[PDB]
């Protein structure tokens, strides 16, 4: 219960012994008791809905637990310190997880480093928006997930790179990413149906390109075009290529006049719609 | 001469698109010369050069019709080489 | 605007933040009247008119 007395009785109990207090063995029993109690204390603040004070209570517990010698669960206390300000409003969970991930990889490990590097990336994408750094976090983290054949996040965090990167700034990465996912997507008997929208994303990114480079993917890809769900990928394209190439808008726009009913359009698709018609503006708008 | 790495770009303006000539820069080739674009060990195409002070040294600009024949993309690497005709059987008479 | 030894054209200035210091931005008409494309370095110089003779009265 004590929000303060566990602290006050442990702060007078944390001290290095070169004195009459030294004696025979260390005070590692004392700081072990203290850090277990700090863990309970950061629990009682989080139970009391104090995720800032609780999160800082995790921060002392999480930093002081390394002082005996415990890098094992000090990483867990770092994640708990991160989860508190991740749940609470502000930042500084970013530092709890950057203290976490380096120490976790310093154990001789790979996975959870990436599994919270994505957490920092989610914060720096959604919340503490630093997408030019979060996308690097997805990138290096997906490099770790690639080097462990955890193909899930290996494809996923790359998709998070490319879906925002293409629209904002990186163009050859768009098709290079959606082809790297697309080949091994065609490989597995589990994956080759997810490849349809993956090559849709490879195609409909136009990179200031007026061409049928999407049709280069058509006469590349294993569509099996009697599968009509790729006609919402490329017959869409077989209209709009020549709509954009004949600088025409009442066929290009008509494609989504009919395609909005047969497919709900999210923000990224309509932003790419607006992207290719900014290329149409640059073809038409004087 | 023997061939160099070039990068495909877009024709500067609509003025050089009605000439059916590969627009380049004066720092690389020279107006009057002919070239043979190479894209594979089986697709060899031959165009005419025309300099223009807007092309980037080390890149060739093509119009859509030229790009609509050779399957060329805006932003790829291609090997372009000067190609000199022979005035015996290569002079067109009935086309 | 000085581009070549036989093309001296006169334009009106208007500052704007997006433009890069040491770069002049033109519109489609201008760039289709002066025969210019992006990536070519032009020689820009201020020019001042004669108020009595140049001012327009019937155009």
From Swiss-Prot, chain A:
GO biological process, alphabetically ordered: apical protein localization; brain development; intracellular protein transport; membrane fusion; neuron differentiation; positive regulation of ATP-dependent activity; protein-containing complex disassembly; regulation of synaptic vesicle priming
A family per Pfam: SNAP
Compartment annotation: Cell membrane
Record's GO cellular component terms: glutamatergic synapse; neuromuscular junction; postsynapse; presynapse; presynaptic active zone membrane; synaptobrevin 2-SNAP-25-syntaxin-1a complex; terminal bouton
Swiss-Prot/TrEMBL keywords: Acetylation, Cell membrane, ER-Golgi transport, Membrane, Phosphoprotein, Protein transport, Transport
rRNA processing recorded as keyword: no
Principal location class: membrane
GO molecular function: protein-containing complex binding; SNARE binding; soluble NSF attachment protein activity; syntaxin binding
Chain positions with Phosphoserine modification: 19, 22, 188
The UniProt record lists the keyword Acetylation: yes
Membrane topology category: Peripheral membrane protein
Quaternary structure and partners: Interacts with PRKCABP, and disrupts the interaction between GRIA2 and PRKCABP, leading to the internalization of GRIA2. Found in a complex with VAMP8. Component of a SNARE-like complex that contains at least ZW10, USE1L, RINT1, STX18 and NAPA/SNAP-alpha. Interacts with VTI1A. Interacts with STX12. Interacts with GNA12 (via N-terminus); the interaction promotes CDH5 localization to plasma membrane.
Function: Required for vesicular transport between the endoplasmic reticulum and the Golgi apparatus. Together with GNA12 promotes CDH5 localization to plasma membrane.
Family classification: Belongs to the SNAP family.
Annotated protein name in UniProt: Alpha-soluble NSF attachment protein
Source organism per UniProt: Rattus norvegicus
Curated annotation (Swiss-Prot), chain B:
Subcellular location: Cytoplasm
Assembly and oligomerization: Homohexamer. Interacts with GABARAP and GABARAPL2. Interacts with GRIA2. Interacts with PLK2, leading to disrupt the interaction with GRIA2. Interacts with MUSK; may regulate MUSK endocytosis and activity. Interacts with CDK16.
UniProt similarity note: Belongs to the AAA ATPase family.
Reported function: Required for vesicle-mediated transport. Catalyzes the fusion of transport vesicles within the Golgi cisternae. Is also required for transport from the endoplasmic reticulum to the Golgi stack. Seems to function as a fusion protein required for the delivery of cargo proteins to all compartments of the Golgi stack independent of vesicle origin. Interaction with AMPAR subunit GRIA2 leads to influence GRIA2 membrane cycling.
Annotated protein name in UniProt: Vesicle-fusing ATPase
Lineage: Eukaryota, Metazoa, Chordata, Craniata, Vertebrata
Gene name of this polypeptide: NSF
Section of the entire sequence shown: 1 to 95 of 744
